[model samples]
Target chain A: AEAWYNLGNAYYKQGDYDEAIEYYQKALELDPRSAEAWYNLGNAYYKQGDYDEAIEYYQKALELDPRSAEAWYNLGNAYYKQGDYDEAIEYYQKALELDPRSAEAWYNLGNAYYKQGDYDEAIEYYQKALELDPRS
Target chain B: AEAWYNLGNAYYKQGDYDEAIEYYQKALELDPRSAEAWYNLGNAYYKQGDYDEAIEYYQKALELDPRSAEAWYNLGNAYYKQGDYDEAIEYYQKALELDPRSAEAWYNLGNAYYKQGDYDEAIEYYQKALELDPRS
Candidate 1:
């Protein structure tokens, strides 16, 4: 599984995501507890715009390591891509709870609220995000 | 039925949309080419969050009056709500073609491209929007 995972990473680096996905699945089958493999699998799917497939792997990654804020953030992104603002807000809040300094997460939360026509909350989150990442 | 359209207008103004929809349908049946009836029927459906239904009536409205930039813009909005960016782009482009000075249409074109990761085109439309609406 380590060899397979390493092979997956190589293909991922070269932008052959389909090849990466095949190897990542092989790695997952052999070593289900590999959280990194699950996360990378989710990333591969996300890169290909298959947000639903990405969500399943990101969820698996979070289940294996509940403290991983990146997994939660990616989960939020997947839900956002599918236009499920409620789920995006839920997972993004979870991410912010674990990693409060994440400006991108705050900014994305603002975006979700803006889409839902909640301007008050959107402005508040945008202010917080600007405090952290003034360049944006 | 002019009376039916008037009755529907009254119900719609009072926010009794179920009743308004019934009267509008009755009005449409009595006078199919009533463009105002078609447009108001779409408005009622749009207010009720039935975007697909709104799209149908808006399409009919546009068929009766091909010069309505507002109808084209509303059709773009319905497609945008449904996450069909390609159709949204097409309808929005048509709207801009009919009414070049509309800031909202330019801004929405930017949003659709932004969602599709076409940052270059998004910025171009955003610039056009800002030119038309300096306060925005």
Candidate 2:
């Protein structure tokens, strides 16, 4: 059963979100405590534009694995899309604390800073993002 | 005649330096005394990798109009590309004196400052660029 969940992760990594969601759902049915499966499922839902459902699954994943940085980052994205810049910044900061090298998180943090009219902070984060990914 | 000069300006503004060079050449044949045309021609030549031609035109522009900031900026770019950091900074400062709102000039000035190992001055010029164009 865990093998199926891992297979789903493989598919997700290969950009096959539809196939990933199917395998992840099967995995969850076998072991309801599959935190990784919930996280992947939430990601799949987000890719498919079901942000509310994605947030729900991400919350469940966080409940199972409190230190899931990916879950926090995804949740921050959902909240940011819903026009919650402060909450987005909070969650993104937590993700950064866990994984300082997360370039996407830094870029999104810059977006949150820009939304708050903190152009200096926004520029700083953008510079950090550029430093991490020069071609970006 | 002046249409060709204005056409060159339009091309330069859109970042199509090669096309701008062609139009500026045409403009110069019609009215060589036009200092603005000569200055923009230098910029186009500089952008197109013709540093010697750019410097020549910049000198000619300066001969016609000693206060041609655009020509000074183009001269700075030519010198900067040729590894003349001191000369680059001097002309960039002259450009800044003529047009204080030029973020591109400030960015180039910062590059020269950094090349000369003047980190404090480089940081100052970078901040000016950021203030003028935060997204840059």
Candidate 3:
């Protein structure tokens, strides 16, 4: 399992995302419970700008590692890119529940709110982000 | 008054938005009844992402040109960008009241509704757009 997964990472670092995808798939065949594998697969697809594929794999990761804040954040980003504002906001809030201090999450939530035409809520989140930030 | 208004368009062409705003503002000072001046001023501010200013001037334009569909449409856009979903949706419908076949306005109404978390209305508008459009 490690052998296939590490090869996938090597291909990913080499910028051969399609090849990396194949390796990751192979890894998943034997290591179906590996959240890291699913997460890395999601990252590979996200890097390729295939948000649907990224979303699917990210969901798989979350199924195995429900409290992984980063997976929730990535899923939120995928939904946001697809312009599914409701789903994006839902997952972003989930990310916050796991990692409440994430400045990026707060800022992204503000963006989602603005895109959804809730300027009041966007401003509120923007102010919350500013309050939490000491140097930005 | 014409001189001031014409100069505003000239300054606008020079990409000097602040100067364009001043000339448009000056035109309004002398020709307070000129919907054209108010409309041009709204355009200037909207281009600068100053939606509140755009909304103000666009409203003035509508006061003078109540039957002008374009003014209502622009007012709707300003409110939408400012993330005021209710106001945006209201003005978008006002635009439709004057010109029911405006594809842009119809499409934008769907966006406003989606932003307001009314998926059913957004879908209705989307289907309406598809029905009206034969070549897209």
Candidate 4:
């Protein structure tokens, strides 16, 4: 299972999402509770632009490890890409609660507000992100 | 000077960058310290894909107004286009120091680091940029 997961990671790094998915599924089949495998499988699907499948895998990862900020963030991003700003915002906020210094979460919050036509709130969130990472 | 500068602006807006450069040069002849004119001339060169000339003009703009984050950012972009990652990083750092919230600068810095094969540093900058502008 670990070897399969590592193979999946290697293929993922090379941008071979199809191969990564194949290996990740193999790893998951061997150990269905492997949060790392589920999360990486989510990442592979996300790279392939299959956000729905990515979200499903991410959810499974989160169920195994509720404290995984990366999984929460990726789930938020998937929803954001799907134009579900409200759902994205909810997940982003959850991610932020787990990791308050997340500049990405703050930025995504700003985007959600911006999409909702709340310019002032968006700017506020953007400012918070800039405070955390001024270069951003 | 005003007439020439206005003509340059018109040409620039019309996408006639060659004409814009010509008029901007004439404007600079009258007022060499006009940072706006120098900046616009740099922009004209940039639009023409004459990155070397763009760097020259952007340098002049910075010499006149060292605090111009826009000029610093453009200089970074010019260096990046020339494949000078080290120089690009320097100018991008300067731009971030001046503005401290430029998402574009953060993104460009990520690109520079990525080009240098510094994936970890690249991801750091990319995350910073995403924090400031999630849609980016």
The order of the candidates by lDDT, greatest first, is 1, 4, 3, 2
Calculate the i-RMS of every candidate, to one decimal place.
Answer: 19.7, 15.9, 20.9, 11.6
lDDT of 2: 0.83
Best candidate according to TM-score: 4
Instruction: Tell me which of candidates 1 and 2 scores higher on TM-score.
Output: 1
Q: Give the whole-model CA lDDT for all candidates, comma-separated.
A: 0.87, 0.83, 0.85, 0.87
Candidate 3 off by > 4 Å: A1-136, B134-136
Q: Give TM-scores for every candidate, taking all chains together and pairing residue i with residue i.
A: 0.52, 0.46, 0.51, 0.53
lDDT of 4 by residue, A29-119 (tens): 7779888889999999999999999999999999999999999989999999999998998999999999999888898899988998989
Encode model 3's per-residue lDDT on B1-136: one tens digit a residue. 8999999999988887789999988887888898988898989999887988888888888888899999998988888998888988999999999998876677788778766766566656754664565222
Q: What is the TM-score of chain A alone in each candidate?
A: 0.95, 0.81, 0.91, 0.97
DockQ of each: 0.02, 0.02, 0.01, 0.01
I-RMSD for candidate 3: 20.9
Error of 2 at B80 (Å): 32
lDDT of candidate 1 over A26-82, digit per residue (tens): 998899997888999999999888998999899889889999999999999899889
Which runs in model 2 stand beyond 4 Å of their true positions?
A3-19, B1-136
Q: Which 10 consecutive residues of model 4 chain A have the lowest summed lDDT?
A: A1-10
Query: For candidate 2, lDDT tens digit of each residue in B80-118?
Result: 999999988899999899999999999999999998899
Error of 3 at A132 (Å): 16
